[PDB]
């Protein structure tokens, strides 16, 4: 089977460029898009991660993919955009993974309390 049974690469692993407040490659990274964590493989900072329950606002412009992470992060205390050539694709994939995973590491926030 291989409709969208994608490998760890080609689609989900996107070599991005960590660029901050200038679009300046301040450490061009990866953005490993998974179910719930956006695993950015930095230069020297190692695989940074962005859990989906943190991406306030995530985007895409001309090879620029972004997300406003609403927690503290390894290297992204807020709107942290990367110059991702597959920004479109990445952002998309992300928004789509967002839609299609519902995103839970574990421990559901008691779905429908009614107590």
């Amino acid at each position: 089977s291989h409709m969208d049974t994608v490998p760890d690469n080609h689609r989900n692993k996107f070599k991005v460029i960590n660029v901050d407040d200038d679009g300046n490659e301040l450490g061009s990274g990866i953005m490993e898009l998974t179910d719930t964590e956006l695993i950015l493989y930095t230069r020297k900072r190692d695989s940074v991660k962005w859990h989906y329950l943190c991406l306030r606002r995530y985007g895409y412009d001309s090879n620029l993919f972004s997300f406003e992470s609403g927690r503290r992060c390894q290297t992204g205390q807020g709107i942290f955009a990367f110059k991702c050539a597959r920004a479109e694709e990445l952002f998309n994939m992300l928004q789509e993974i967002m839609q299609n995973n519902s995103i839970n590491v574990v421990e559901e926030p008691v779905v429908e309390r009614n107590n």
Binding site: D21, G23, Y52, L53, R57, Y58, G59, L64, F65, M98
Partner: peptide, 23 residues
């Protein structure tokens, strides 16, 4: 607005997550 991250080279027109709205 902030919903575009204007990261120097490029302004990123971002969107908000359905995770906070689909828990």
């Amino acid at each position: 607005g902030p919903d575009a991250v204007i990261i120097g080279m490029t302004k990123i027109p971002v969107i908000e997550n359905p995770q906070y709205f689909g828990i």
